[PDB]
Amino acid sequence: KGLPLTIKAVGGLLLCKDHVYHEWRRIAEHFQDELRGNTSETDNVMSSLQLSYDELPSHLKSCILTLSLYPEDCVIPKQQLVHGWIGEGFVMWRNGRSATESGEDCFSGLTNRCLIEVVDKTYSGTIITCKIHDMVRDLVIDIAKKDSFSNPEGLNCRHLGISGNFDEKQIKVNHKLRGVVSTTKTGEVNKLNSDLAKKFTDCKYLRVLDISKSIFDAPLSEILDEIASLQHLACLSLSNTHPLIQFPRSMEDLHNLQILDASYCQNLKQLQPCIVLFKKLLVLDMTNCGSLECFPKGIGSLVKLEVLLGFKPARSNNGCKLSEVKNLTNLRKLGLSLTRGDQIEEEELDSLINLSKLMSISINCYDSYGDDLITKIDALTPPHQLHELSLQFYPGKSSPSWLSPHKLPMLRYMSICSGNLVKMQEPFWGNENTHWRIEGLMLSSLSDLDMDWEVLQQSMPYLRTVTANWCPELESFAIEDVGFRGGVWMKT
Amino acid sequence: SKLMSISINCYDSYGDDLITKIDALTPPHQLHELSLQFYPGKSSPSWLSPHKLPMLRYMSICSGNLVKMQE
Amino acid sequence: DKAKRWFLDNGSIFLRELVADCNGKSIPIRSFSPEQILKATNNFDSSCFVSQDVYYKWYRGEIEDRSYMIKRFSEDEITGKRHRVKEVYNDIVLSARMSNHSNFLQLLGCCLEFPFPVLVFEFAEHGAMNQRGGVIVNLLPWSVRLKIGKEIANAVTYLHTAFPKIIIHRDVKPMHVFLDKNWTAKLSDLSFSISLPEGKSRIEAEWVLGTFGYIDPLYHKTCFVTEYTDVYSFGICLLVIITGKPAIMTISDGDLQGILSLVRELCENGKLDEVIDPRLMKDITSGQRLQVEACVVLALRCCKERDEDRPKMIQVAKELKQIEASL
Amino acid sequence: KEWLTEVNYLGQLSHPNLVLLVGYCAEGENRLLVYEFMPKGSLENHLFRRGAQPLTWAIRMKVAVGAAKGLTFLHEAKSQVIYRDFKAANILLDADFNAKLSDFTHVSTKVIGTHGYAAPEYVATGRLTAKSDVYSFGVVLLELISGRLFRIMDTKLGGQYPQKGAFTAANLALQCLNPDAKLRPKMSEVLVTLE
Amino acid sequence: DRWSSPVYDHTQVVGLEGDKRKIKEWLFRSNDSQLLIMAFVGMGGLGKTTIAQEVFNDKEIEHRFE
Numbered sequence A: 001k002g003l004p005l006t007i008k009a010v011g012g013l014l015l016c017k018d019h020v021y022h023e024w025r026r027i028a029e030h031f032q033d034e035l036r037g038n039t040s041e042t043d044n045v046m047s048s049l050q051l052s053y054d055e056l057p058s059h060l061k062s063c064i065l066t067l068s069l070y071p072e073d074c075v076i077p078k079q080q081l082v083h084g085w086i087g088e089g090f091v092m093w094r095n096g097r098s099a100t101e102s103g104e105d106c107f108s109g110l111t112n113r114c115l116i117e118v119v120d121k122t123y124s125g126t127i128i129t130c131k132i133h134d135m136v137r138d139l140v141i142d143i144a145k146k147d148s149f150s151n152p153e154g155l156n157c158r159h160l161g162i163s164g165n166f167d168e169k170q171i172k173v174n175h176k177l178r179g180v181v182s183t184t185k186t187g188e189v190n191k192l193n194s195d196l197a198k199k200f201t202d203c204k205y206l207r208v209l210d211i212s213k214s215i216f217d218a219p220l221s222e223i224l225d226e227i228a229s230l231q232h233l234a235c236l237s238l239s240n241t242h243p244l245i246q247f248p249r250s251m252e253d254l255h256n257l258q259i260l261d262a263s264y265c266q267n268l269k270q271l272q273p274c275i276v277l278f279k280k281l282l283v284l285d286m287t288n289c290g291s292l293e294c295f296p297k298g299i300g301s302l303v304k305l306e307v308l309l310g311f312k313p314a315r316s317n318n319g320c321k322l323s324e325v326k327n328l329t330n331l332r333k334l335g336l337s338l339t340r341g342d343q344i345e346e347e348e349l350d351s352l353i354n355l356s357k358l359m360s361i362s363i364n365c366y367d368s369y370g371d372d373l374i375t376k377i378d379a380l381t382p383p384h385q386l387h388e389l390s391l392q393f394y395p396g397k398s399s400p401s402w403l404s405p406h407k408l409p410m411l412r413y414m415s416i417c418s419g420n421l422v423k424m425q426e427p428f429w430g431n432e433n434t435h436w437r438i439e440g441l442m443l444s445s446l447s448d449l450d451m452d453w454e455v456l457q458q459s460m461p462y463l464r465t466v467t468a469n470w471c472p473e474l475e476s477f478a479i480e481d482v483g484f485r486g487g488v489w490m491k492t
Numbered sequence B: 001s002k003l004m005s006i007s008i009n010c011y012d013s014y015g016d017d018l019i020t021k022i023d024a025l026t027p028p029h030q031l032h033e034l035s036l037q038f039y040p041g042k043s044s045p046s047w048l049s050p051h052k053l054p055m056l057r058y059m060s061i062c063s064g065n066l067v068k069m070q071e
Numbered sequence C: 001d002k003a004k005r006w007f008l009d010n011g012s013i014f015l016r017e018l019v020a021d022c023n024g025k026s027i028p029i030r031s032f033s034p035e036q037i038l039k040a041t042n043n044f045d046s047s048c049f050v051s052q053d054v055y056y057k058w059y060r061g062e063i064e065d066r067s068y069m070i071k072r073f074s075e076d077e078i079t080g081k082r083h084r085v086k087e088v089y090n091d092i093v094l095s096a097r098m099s100n101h102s103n104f105l106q107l108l109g110c111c112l113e114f115p116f117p118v119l120v121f122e123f124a125e126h127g128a129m130n131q132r133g134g135v136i137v138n139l140l141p142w143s144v145r146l147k148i149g150k151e152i153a154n155a156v157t158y159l160h161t162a163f164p165k166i167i168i169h170r171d172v173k174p175m176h177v178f179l180d181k182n183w184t185a186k187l188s189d190l191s192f193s194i195s196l197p198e199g200k201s202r203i204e205a206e207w208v209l210g211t212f213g214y215i216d217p218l219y220h221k222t223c224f225v226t227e228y229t230d231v232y233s234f235g236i237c238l239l240v241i242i243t244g245k246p247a248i249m250t251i252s253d254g255d256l257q258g259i260l261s262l263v264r265e266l267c268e269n270g271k272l273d274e275v276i277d278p279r280l281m282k283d284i285t286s287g288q289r290l291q292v293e294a295c296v297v298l299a300l301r302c303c304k305e306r307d308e309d310r311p312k313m314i315q316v317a318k319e320l321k322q323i324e325a326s327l
Numbered sequence D: 001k002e003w004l005t006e007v008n009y010l011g012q013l014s015h016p017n018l019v020l021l022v023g024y025c026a027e028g029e030n031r032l033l034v035y036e037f038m039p040k041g042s043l044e045n046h047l048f049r050r051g052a053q054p055l056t057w058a059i060r061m062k063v064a065v066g067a068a069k070g071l072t073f074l075h076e077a078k079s080q081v082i083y084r085d086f087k088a089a090n091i092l093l094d095a096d097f098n099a100k101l102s103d104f105t106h107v108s109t110k111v112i113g114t115h116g117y118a119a120p121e122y123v124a125t126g127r128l129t130a131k132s133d134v135y136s137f138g139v140v141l142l143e144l145i146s147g148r149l150f151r152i153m154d155t156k157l158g159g160q161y162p163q164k165g166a167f168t169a170a171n172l173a174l175q176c177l178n179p180d181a182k183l184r185p186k187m188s189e190v191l192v193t194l195e
Numbered sequence E: 001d002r003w004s005s006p007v008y009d010h011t012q013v014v015g016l017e018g019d020k021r022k023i024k025e026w027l028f029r030s031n032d033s034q035l036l037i038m039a040f041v042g043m044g045g046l047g048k049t050t051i052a053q054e055v056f057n058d059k060e061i062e063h064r065f066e
């Protein structure tokens, strides 16, 4: 796979043979075990990569070491790695860089050493999926062949990663097990039985338990009923599991529980009132969980959290409103999703001006009902610091009447997905002296949106790329087709 | 799959039925050395061809009743 | 009861192949109790029925302060064959994935304790479109017809172009288009479509199916799918939109009227003066005539006997947009 | 309900260019029949694999005349009996080169004529006539001459110009194979216009 | 100990002439800036020192840089 170093090493290895078929065939099927002998220490590919390993800081050594836990060329999501690093404690923090941004700069510290390479990147420059070259991968495996981080054969392991379809193969699990991760190769689902998930709850010292693509036999309420035996558990991403309807009610003694993730699980009816009192939460992440009764009451009671996605603000005598969001002075990512008019309240419409450390807002008006929601959105004012916003289904026809450089000057990135939006209001331009200072713009699927191009270029002087791909009605932009396909307009 | 060498010792051979039944024993396409060494047949064993074993490098024929090689 | 068995099996098939198709990153499906859609459709047997097909049946309905549209898969037809269960599940997955485009009929939720799942969609006050038009007690103005032709052209281009795997809905048909309050057309029923593998615009299927008179006889002979096999069916679609005659028609004799043969002979002999619809002749048709016949020449251009003479679908939708932008 | 009807239509089937009723019994089940044996099978056993037989001269065209003669039993003495599955796998062969035939609402999956044996008006409509039958018999003739003044329909025996079946069969083709439905031929003329 | 040198073999170097061309037209514009500085960034054992040796052992660079 492309490296000239490994190719010249294999050439120097095969140069001292007799060119008969059998050693060539077995080197073709036993490959890694010879380049780690280095023809008994003469060419040393492993040294030339291990010297790049051996100048990391020690926490970055621990963070890069967990990528020996994945299959051959799987495309690893960033978010799962960052949550594992926050969970089992490879990341320390005191000076405000508390949870998410420390995972961000640890991940950027690894990708800036050219150890982890990216796969795809959004309009806003953020990274979602990453992979590694396989020589780095079996280097990290051979370093995990040391201290019992990842054995994966035999007894002594400190944490374990499950591949696909272990319903019948009976992975050995001892009582050490500081983590259990689920590694899938972008599309498979780990077929799991009940007894392995019962033996997961037998591990006394288990800090990371993320189950990302698995189908179980029984409902998860009685499977994970004995998680009271789990005491020092830090993370749970119960994303994308079939039998999950109600997470178990023995979740009162989990007093550590630094994050809690359950994304894209469409059947999550009740969230228990025990996710109020433990006050040491960092990330609560319910994105796109449709059937959900939209929260418990004391969300503003716990204060040390940073990410709150899929809020679903409740009705009058229901759940929780937007009033306690003023109490959450530490969050920096926030995700709203709105259904009808009585989701929000009148004097709570200024609930988003005192969030000092807020960075991004996502608004998901997917299952919108009436024009009362459209009239009541237009008073929700974001703070004057705001880095990214993504309104994405938005049943209104005009702009939301705060989308102006006066109400938010420091906006840099912005995307608009599907919508009933027809045109932008006059505050959206505001070109007497103020301008957007915006840099990345995305218009995904808009069949009613009409505006010009040079008016944008005289209203947005700091653009770099504008990615629009389904807008059959402009035909004035510089990209190849604003209609059916898409371009980026990467200017000079 | 991992076979390298074959030695055939037809020393105390008896009848022509053995000669007729040898000729269906096909070695794998990878084969480095073969040594048939007493071989009561008169022709070649009818697999001794570059089609049936391309990667043959070394070969010995000891004593035998072999008369000529086939086409 | 046994409803748990329905649930724990149907959704496992469901989740496994939507992770296989979409990697989970998808749309907010809302689950249900049974009784909401049971009393919403009045226990499946009422006058709230919209329209049927082989596998499924479309109902209207009403859950608390919102009317919805409900799609059930009929039990006997899907249980007679035991191997074509997967067209149901990729119908639900493709209807989930196409819901972020405006010209489709968005999946709002699923209940999955039933035959196999039962789907729910947002409301459209006009029903499905008939062999001629509205299935309401009704007449459609012609600008509305040109607009909805443009819209389901956009939707078919969205299937062909938006992904590295080309979805080809071979059953493009006037029976699948719905119409809302604002007469915006919305396709549905992606159960019959297949995904081409990546990079290749041509593979062979191994059976041929779907509604006589929309076949692409190229595909009926050869049995391999290209995107032009969709273009021919789309051509007969907007033929039915204009003329208002069914694609299978009779005049007293064996029930045989090849409608596109009739339109091409009235093109070459009757000279385009008879395709303007005796329920629509009282329209002003001042400059509307020349663009009616521009659409007819376009539709006959996209139903020619060789696919090299047919335009690609992107082009067809572009020149439809030019036609309505002529005025 | 499914039994006296079988007595009705199988009681009228006795014709030498059909597959004769070797298997008729109680037969409470669906098709599991073995009309015992066929020595050569269909024309795909000789035309489309190149190890069994080479093609003949004007020999198999009279076998096609025999298949046409079975169709003259089919379409004429009927009240409504239409064979509806004309392709080269259904016309069969004996050792004496004998043609034989066998295997007599809205369905989405198309099975009738999944290749070029289908009528264009049938693809457009789905009503199956005896004139769609003569169209499909025409493409049967096209296949047995071709193998899917440029008379290079043969690649092995290219001296059929004096044999005149090229001329008459091309006339029957190019008159039969027109895409309309109101100048359609009939099977008796297809018999008598070569002998 | 690990070290490097401008001495290489220039026969086993499998094609780099597009990158060599691009870096030569980058070096031809050195007077446009006050001090042109450039970076070759990649993982370990990728071709960085070899493309550097391929660049400044060319003749035209020695015509430019003394």
Ligand SMILES: Nc1ncnc2c1ncn2[C@H]1C[C@H](O)[C@@H](COP(=O)(O)OP(=O)(O)OP(=O)(O)O)O1
Binding pocket: A004, A005, A008, A048, E012, E013, E014, E015, E016, E042, E043, E044, E045, E046, E047, E048, E049, E050, E051
């Ligand atoms: N294009 C090439 N053609 C032939 N051999 C090459 C090519 N590129 C690199 N090599 C060989 C030369 C050496 O044997 C080996 C290492 O290359 P080298 O340039 O020294 O690594 P590098 O500079 O990319 O990284 P590092 O300096 O960290 O080792 O690869």
